[PDB]
């Protein structure tokens, strides 16, 4: 029957021992000066409730049922300063306090591993209006576009997130998220006009007066108005974007 | 005096042993291939510094002083895709990448357990303008209202949070958070007018001209103006909301 | 050669034992009713993969390579209600559900320890328009200013973050982030006018008519217009901020 020594009252040990681990069936306390640690492991293999340190991702992880080796404690924000460099490259789960006082800097998103992989940046100097920041998604696309994206808003802060490859990167958490006037004096009596870029909504002024909603229809980047206007007429148009 | 065997130089063990736990008073290292794990426990009972895995909430938790069994590592974001379904039900601490390309989908917030319980959603397809999303709070109320709430903004992302039952759910973290023109030609000489919904602020135009702030007062969904206006007068009103 | 007892088949122990720790080289399972725990430690000294509980910060921490003793699981949000008090003081990593129904309350940011140190607040009652909240940064400055900051927006929620001492505190995560009309009838024929505060952009109306972009230039808090206007002229100016 019994296969191995048993110690009714347990026992004591006054030096570091060497085990091939075990199954605990009771309570694991500590005394002062006691230390603890995790296996420095790197594999993709594991089983739920199993836990490790990682000496590459410098991140205390735990194997979850759906997925496996997530960061322990869920999602989290690694707040570090970034010393201004023309180009910088950013690591998942880290958030960067950017300075653009020097001038315009760039940052390159990492290659996404898992969905959720989440990076964060913050205009902590409020310099982005004066000296913008651009965001290189690398091979993988951002909001569908492989093309980079620029940031122009003093004081802004954004969390980027991998959504899968079609839409690629997107913004999840964040903080901090165009007055056209075409005017001229009709050389002739004219029934239509074309604005330099399509406006969403527009206000029209004919001489002094504010023209009525009925007097025109607006479509794309052109404005018809019945009745057609006479020559010598100062018309103001306020393209809204 | 002594009650149990003592091992001056500690010892060695080349197989998995079986303990009723203990109190460590020194350093707990590991060698390569070493593994670690947590008790698969489910109770509400525990004591600070005590820690576990949970085989229901699939979440590495730790008993804190104020509260008890929180998720270890504080609050975190479980980023998963959601395959479009007319109805879906959402789990705390998880964040969902929603698609509404198919059409309009719905999601039901879980029953809140603790205050803080925090869910997150994201229009990762930018389809919410074209095909909105609605948010069922279930029995418990949202911002005071038991009534559901709809979302209409292309590209949006929101973190919901339980605040307690009076106000119920609210939005904490998030990203991405109405041109009325009444016009007519006064049949008669008229001293007042009623707008179809109360405007907050309004611009008034009488014939061509932009009427002065003194000429009217505005209240609720009606506009008085002294002096009272004459008949045959084209007046434009720009309800702002 | 051998220095300490070895137990080929490992062994068993039916009571809590007392160790000076060890190096595990195998697998550390558990049985039902098994418990676990961390050393209640307080020092700044430690080595990566080492982990502890803290009986002051009531926070399960782990020593990371760059930095040392971070909270395990990265950044996280400690959601608690705050019972309205004229003054309250706030702890890092905690997020407060504020009520200002009573009246105007204040909150004092803690002294920042590490960069990243991140506090969060939320107008969960939507009372901030009616009864504002103010934010004392203490000695350390907020966005450069040592001067406090007030909050006026019903429904808002903000994450504060320590960036370093020059800019001090800033806002990273968050949710929820001025109609001047000067009018008069020119006593005389006047070529310039001064607005009570500099406007960014402005709309000008002369009698009824909306004046053209060419007719004036705007600078600081003054408006020139060529040609200079005649006396008896009702002019409206819409300061935009």
Numbering used by the authors:
A (entry chain A), B (entry chain A), C (entry chain A): 4 to 180, 187 to 250
Publication passage describing the model:
Bacteriophage (phage) vB_EcoM_CBA120, discovered by Kutter and colleagues, is a member of the recently defined Kuttervirus genus of contractile tailed phages belonging to the Ackermannviridae family. Each TSP recognizes a different lipopolysaccharide on the membrane of a different bacterial host. The 335 N-terminal residues of TSP4 promote the assembly of the TSP complex and anchor it to the tail baseplate.
Herewith we refer to this construct as TSP4-N490. This protein degraded within the period of crystal growth in poly ethylene glycol 8000 solution, yielding a structure that lacked the XD3 domain. Although the exact cleavage site is unknown, 250 residues could be traced in the electron density map. In the following discussion, this structure is named TSP4-N250 to distinguish it from TSP4-N253, one of the protein variants that was designed to identify the TSP4-N domain interactions with partner TSPs by AUC. The TSP4-N250 structure was determined by molecular replacement. In contrast, the analogous binding surface of the closely associated XD2 trimer as seen in the TSP4-N250 structure, is more neutral, with three lysine residues forming a positively charged patch in the center of the solvent exposed surface. The TSP4 XD2 trimer binding surface, as seen in the TSP4-N250 crystal structure, exhibits positively charged residues at the center and negatively charged residues at the rim. Nevertheless, the TSP4-N250 crystal structure shows that the TSP4 XD2 domain can form a closely packed trimer and the flexible linkers can adjust the relative orientations between the globular trimeric domains.
